[PDB]
Amino acid sequence: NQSASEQLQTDIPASISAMVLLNSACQGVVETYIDQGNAEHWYAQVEQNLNAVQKLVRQWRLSGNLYFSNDIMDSVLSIANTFKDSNVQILTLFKALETRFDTAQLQQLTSLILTLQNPIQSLTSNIKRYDEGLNAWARQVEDAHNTLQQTIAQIQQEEVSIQAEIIATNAQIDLMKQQIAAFKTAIANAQSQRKKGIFETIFGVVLAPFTLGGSLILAGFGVSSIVEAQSEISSLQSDIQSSLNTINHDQQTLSQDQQQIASLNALLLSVDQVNNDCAAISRSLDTLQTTVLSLYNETNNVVSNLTKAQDSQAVILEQVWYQSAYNEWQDILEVASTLNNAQPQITKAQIKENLY
Amino acid sequence: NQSASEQLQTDIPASISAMVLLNSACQGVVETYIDQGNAEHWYAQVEQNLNAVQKLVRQWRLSGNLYFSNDIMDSVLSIANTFKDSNVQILTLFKALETRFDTAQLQQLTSLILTLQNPIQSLTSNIKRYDEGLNAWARQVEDAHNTLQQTIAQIQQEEVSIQAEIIATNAQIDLMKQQIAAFKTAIANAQRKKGIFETIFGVVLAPFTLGGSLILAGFGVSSIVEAQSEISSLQSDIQSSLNTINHDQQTLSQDQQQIASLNALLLSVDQVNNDCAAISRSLDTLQTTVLSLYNETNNVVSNLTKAQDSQAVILEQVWYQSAYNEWQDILEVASTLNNAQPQITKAQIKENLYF
Ligand SMILES: [Cl-]
Ligand SMILES: [K+]
Closest-CA residue of A relative to B32 is A58
Distance between CA atoms of residues A46 and A27, nearest Å: 19
CA dist A250 and A157 (Å) reads: 18
Of A59, A210, A218, the CB nearest to B61: A218
Residue of B33, B62, B63, B339 to mutate, interface with A, max A Cβ within 10 Å: B62
* Range B247-254, long-range pairs (CB < 8 A, 24+ positions): B248/B165, B248/B168, B248/B169, B248/B172, B249/B165, B249/B169, B251/B162, B251/B165, B252/B162, B252/B165, B254/B37, B254/B206, B254/B207, B254/B208, B254/B214
Q: Is the dihedral of CA B83, B89, B91, B97 positive or negative?
A: negative
Interface check B346 vs A, CB under 8 A:
yes
Are B194 and B340 contacting, i.e. CB atoms less than 8 angstroms apart?
Answer: yes
Whether residue B345 and residue A346 make contact (CB cut-off 8 A), yes or no, is yes
Name which of A248, A227, A261 is nearest A338 in CA terms.
Answer: A227
Contacts of B31 in chain A (CB under 8 A): 30
Calpha distance A127→A11 (Å, rounded): 13
Alpha helices in B63-116 (DSSP H): 70-99, 103-114
- Flag whether A67 is in a domain: yes
CB contacts, 8 Å: B343 with chain A: 345, 347
Quick check: is A337 in a domain? yes
Do the chains contact at A30 and B30, CB–CB below 8 Å?
Answer: yes
Residue A356, in any domain of the structure: no
Resolution (A): 1.8
Q: How far is B55 from chain A (nearest CA, A)?
A: 9
How far is the C-alpha of B83 from the C-alpha of B336, rounded, in Å?
18
SS3 A187: helix
Ligand 1 centroid to A328 CA: how many Å? 13
**What is d(CA A173, CA A246) in angstroms, rounded to the nearest whole number?**
10
Residue B318 buriedness (CB in 10 A; 0-12 / 13-18 / 19+): exposed
CB contact (8 A) between residue B30 and residue A35: no
The rounded distance, in Å, linking the Cα atoms of A164 and B327 is: 50
- Report yes or no: B65 and B21 within 8 Å, Cβ to Cβ: no
3-state DSSP assignment of residue B209: coil
From chain B, pick out residues whose CB is under 8 angstroms from the CB of A215.
Answer: 62, 64
Interface membership of A334 toward B (CB under 8 Å):
no
A282 CA from centroid of ligand 1 (Å): 24
Estimate to the nearest angstrom the gap between the alpha carbon of A264 and the chain centroid: 26
Whether B208 sits inside 8 A of A58 (CB atoms) is no
Residue B65: closest CA among chain A residues belongs to which residue? Answer: A214
Chain B touched by A48 (CB under 8 Å) = no
Residue B144 domain-assigned? yes
Minimal C-alpha gap between A341 and chain B (Å): 13
Asked whether the beta carbons of residue A213 and residue B71 sit closer than 8 angstroms, the reply is: yes
CA A181 remoteness from chain centre: 13
- Residue B53 parent element (H or E): helix B42-62
- Domain containing B176 equals 4-349
Asked if residues A46 and A151 have their Cβ atoms less than 8 Å apart, the reply is yes
Does B354 reside within a domain?
Answer: no
Residues of chain B found within 8 Å of residue A35, distances taken between Cβ atoms: 58-59, 62
B58 Cβ under 8 Å from any chain A Cβ: yes
A263 interfacial to chain B (CB closer than 8 Å): no
Residues of B in contact with A59 (CB under 8 A): 35
CATH assignment at residue A163: 1.20.1170.10
Q: B173, B159, B204, B166: which is closest to B39 by C-alpha?
A: B159
Q: Which residues of A touch B69 (CB under 8 A)?
A: none
| Long-range contacts at B74-77 (CB < 8 A, ≥ 24 apart) | B74/B126, B75/B119, B75/B122, B75/B123, B75/B126, B76/B12, B76/B123, B76/B330, B76/B334, B77/B331, B77/B334, B77/B335, B77/B338
Q: Which ligand is nearest to the CA of A247?
A: 2
In a domain, residue B193? The reply is yes
**With an 8 Å Cβ cutoff, is B242 touching chain A?**
no
Subunit contact A35:B212, Cβ cutoff 8 A = no
Per the domain annotation, does B96 fall within a domain? yes
Report yes or no: A32 and A220 within 8 Å, Cβ to Cβ.
yes
| Of A344, A59, A223, A218, nearest in space to B199 by CA | A344
Q: Which amino acid is at A335?
A: V
Domain count, chain A: 1
